[PDB]
Design a protein around this ligand. Structure first.
Ligand SMILES: *[C@@H]1O[C@H](CO)[C@@H](O)[C@H](O)[C@H]1NC(C)=O
Ligand SMILES: [Zn+2]
Lengths: 598, 196
């Protein structure tokens, strides 16, 4: 009996001391590559990557010998089952290298793709800052439309054949691992089994996502109605009062966040502005000040101040034309106590809150670092993207902004300030939900089947018109690939983490405000000085994967599933007001109206 | 009028010992100015057990062993009497009634280099705990089950020791700390070491 527990415990205590450096050496080659796209780095990255995967196959093979049914300690059953799963090794070596070329080419096309001026081919725009400044600030419909379609025609059209191959190979790999498809592979992070009474299943995730979204559509239809009703002032001949919105007039290149619509849709413009972008520029803040102010929030709730290696090794400012670095913000744990952020910041409220969010990934990465190697990962994908966004819910408040000097000390917390704040939050948090659900529904179907090759773009744009209420400026045919033109689609990440975190952030926020002994409306709770609220969180961050997400949630907020009630109870003071504003105008949209045909 | 001990030849030796096979120096027939070590600015740990650290320049002893080695800064909390974990259990054990001092400092500028150091080893499996002050410099393959191991690594058959891998950018809990453990002895006979 006990021999096949001690044999397994001995084996994992070989793996945890042998794996740890191969993973570090691999990670440190990827950091040197992403901080300058150069062939000398790509060689090292491929060499250290091969060493890691070639090792993993041997340890996986040794782990295969032990009976999965004999180990009884839960954490060793989890920690061993991660080695017994094959992963990519099910493909032939040529076919596996074929897939690794596809991923590296798609990644390089995204991170180096560009558009150029039609009169002046000497002048070319990268996405950051070039096209981002156009889509964030231009009020010329024609320039916005050009910037919007040129990225989709010039780079989205290149990725179509690669994304076809990626869909084919990843499905065959996932199916030889006994999942139904590669969508099912991704839904597998939410699965809990073996612990009875706390179980969860890869099918049920679809039920709970589609069941919670039904209870969010009413807030969205009212917010969409209000935004549409006001954009007609800015783009008068282009927008229907009863149609879906033109995609390029949303506050972003994809419409992932509506934040930059705020200046066009702010309710009470006569008060001091809640968007502190101008006040930060006026006081001449900078990259380091933004991350220093981010660090002050986490330490004032009693979590650790940053590792010195963070401040010395991180890339917090754009390196410029000297280096072709990636500029999509990322939080890196290399292993062996080494944590870094790569982020091309500039003075903005968006980058101030995003500095809180990516630093929130580092705090969770510092907390579970005591766990053994294969459990030293977040409790669920959604918790990892929620732990940062709990701090932005708190740090964005006019109450907090006055306390750090980005608002004047005479600022008044009146009943128009409360709606000027919630309308800002609703653009980010509710504007992103239908997009985030809809994009992943498309991928789940594309991997599963029920969307054939000659209907990829057909069903995508039908779903954007039907679910999200957004419409294309001019038709795209099946030579294009619009989804591939977004980082998370291009670079092989599950998107549903951004839906489930958007529910978990309010569940945790309510339960932290009670630890801070707060009373009054939830939407002016600052946890910022409560060490008690920080401890209520920290004692769940230190777990890693060691207890199932259902139980790790249930211990902190008293529910064993994602719940919509705290989201709605946050926005209710806005929702009542939007219902008042929309009483004289159409709520919802026709799917038949067209920017090209009408 | 004085004659100081060769502490320099330990506290600033070029190359330290791999913890599984730690170095030992005897000190005898000499005066040791411990107050200089106590008033050192570089030392991160100076915990003394059974003896008060300011007091050592008053004492006289028969013999003193200075044991030296290098380990991850996070494992320095296993160099104390009564501890457990893979340094204390299997590489270097102090007794439950130790009298002595443990001295340690960060050395990332010296014991760590780009690409990774990979010199310093530690023992990771053993068939029983060490007795205090024992050493086990051996490389016979540990057997985790009922199959005879035949002196070859494989299924259930693990090599007994593993390298550290210090690169310069690893965090504080994985940087190389040099450690020196002083283990004074009074042996119902003459003193040969004193404070001045
Ligand atoms: C609060 O705001 C509403 C409009 O949002 C306004 O009608 C009301 O008069 C305000 N409260 C007070 C005390 O004036
Ligand atoms: Zn993130």
């Amino acid at each position: 009996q006990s021999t096949i527990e001690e044999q397994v415990k001995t084996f994992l205590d070989n793996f945890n001391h042998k794996a740890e450096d191969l993973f570090y050496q691999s990670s440190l080659a990827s950091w040197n590559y992403n901080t300058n796209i150069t062939e000398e780095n790509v060689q090292n990255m491929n060499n250290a990557g091969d060493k890691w995967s070639a090792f993993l196959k041997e340890q996986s093979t040794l782990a295969q010998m032990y009976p999965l049914q004999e180990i009884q300690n839960l954490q060793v059953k989890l920690q061993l089952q991660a080695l017994q799963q094959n992963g990519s090794s099910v493909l032939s070596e040529d076919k596996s290298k074929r897939l690794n070329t596809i991923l590296n080419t798609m990644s390089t096309i995204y991170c180096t793709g560009k558009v150029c001026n039609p009169d002046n081919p000497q002048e070319c725009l990268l996405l950051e800052p070039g096209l981002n400044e156009i889509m964030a600030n231009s009020l010329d419909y024609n320039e916005r439309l050009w910037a919007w379609e040129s990225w989709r025609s010039e780079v989205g059209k290149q990725l179509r054949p690669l994304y076809e191959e990626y869909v084919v190979l990843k499905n065959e790999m996932a199916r030889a691992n006994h999942y139904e498809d590669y969508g099912d592979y991704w839904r597998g992070d939410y699965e809990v089994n073996g612990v009875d009474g706390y179980d969860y299943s890869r099918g049920q995730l679809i039920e709970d996502v589609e069941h919670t979204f039904e209870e969010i559509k009413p807030l969205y239809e009212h917010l969409h109605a209000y935004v549409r009703a006001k954009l007609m002032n800015a783009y008068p001949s282009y927008i229907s009062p009863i149609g879906c919105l033109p995609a390029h007039l949303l506050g972003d290149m994809w419409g992932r966040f509506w934040t930059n619509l705020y200046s066009l849709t702010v309710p009470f413009g006569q008060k001091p502005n809640i968007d502190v972008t101008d006040a930060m520029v006026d006081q001449a803040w900078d990259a380091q000040r933004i991350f220093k102010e981010a660090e002050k929030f986490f330490v004032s709730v009693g979590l650790p101040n940053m590792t010195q290696g963070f401040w010395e090794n991180s890339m917090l400012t754009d390196p410029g034309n000297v280096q072709k670095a990636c500029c999509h913000p990322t939080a890196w744990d290399l292993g062996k106590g080494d944590f870094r952020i790569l982020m091309c910041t500039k003075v903005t409220m968006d980058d101030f809150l995003t500095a809180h969010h990516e630093m929130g990934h580092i705090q969770y990465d510092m907390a579970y670092a005591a766990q053994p190697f294969l459990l030293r990962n977040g409790a669920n994908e959604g918790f990892h993207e929620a732990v940062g966004e709990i701090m932005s819910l708190s740090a964005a408040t006019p109450k907090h902004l006055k306390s750090i000097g980005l608002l004047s000390p005479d600022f008044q917390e009146d009943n128009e300030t409360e709606i000027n704040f919630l309308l800002k939050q609703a653009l980010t948090i509710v504007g992103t939900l239908p997009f985030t659900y809809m994009l992943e529904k498309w991928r789940w179907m594309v991997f599963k089947g029920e969307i054939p090759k000659d209907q990829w773009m057909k069903k995508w744009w039908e779903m954007k018109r039907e679910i999200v209420g957004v419409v294309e400026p001019v038709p795209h045919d099946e030579t294009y690939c619009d989804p591939a033109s977004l980082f998370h689609v291009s670079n092989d990440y599950s998107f549903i983490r951004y839906y489930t975190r958007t529910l978990y952030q309010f569940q945790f926020q309510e339960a932290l405000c009670q630890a801070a002994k707060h009373e009054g409306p939830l939407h002016k709770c600052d946890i910022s000085n409560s060490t008690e609220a920080g401890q209520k969180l920290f004692n769940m961050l230190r777990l890693g994967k060691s207890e199932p997400w259902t139980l790790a949630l249930e211990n902190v907020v008293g529910a064993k599933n994602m719940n919509v009630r705290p989201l709605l109870n946050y926005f209710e003071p806005l929702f009542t007001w939007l219902k008042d504003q929309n009483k004289n105008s159409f709520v919802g949209w026709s799917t038949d109206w067209s920017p090209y045909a009408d | 009028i004085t004659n100081l001990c060769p502490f320099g030849e330990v506290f600033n030796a070029t190359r330290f010992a791999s913890v599984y096979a730690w170095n030992r120096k005897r000190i005898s027939n000499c005066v040791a100015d411990y107050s200089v070590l106590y008033n050192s600015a570089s030392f991160s740990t100076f915990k003394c057990y059974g003896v008060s650290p300011t007091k050592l320049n008053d004492l006289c002893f028969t013999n003193v062993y200075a044991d030296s080695f290098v380990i991850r800064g996070d494992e320095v909390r296993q160099i104390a009497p009564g501890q457990t974990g893979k340094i204390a259990d299997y590489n270097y054990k102090l007794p439950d009634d130790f009298t002595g001092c443990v001295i340690a400092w960060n050395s990332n500028n010296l014991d760590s280099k780009v690409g990774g150091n990979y010199n310093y080893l530690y023992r990771l499996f053993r068939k029983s705990n060490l007795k205090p002050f024992e050493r086990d410099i051996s490389t016979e393959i540990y057997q985790a089950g009922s199959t005879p191991c035949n002196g070859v690594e494989g299924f259930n058959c693990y090599f007994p020791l593993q390298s550290y891998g210090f690169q310069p950018t690893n965090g504080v809990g994985y940087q190389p700390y040099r450690v020196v453990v002083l283990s004074f002895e009074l042996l119902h006979a003459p003193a040969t070491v004193c404070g001045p």
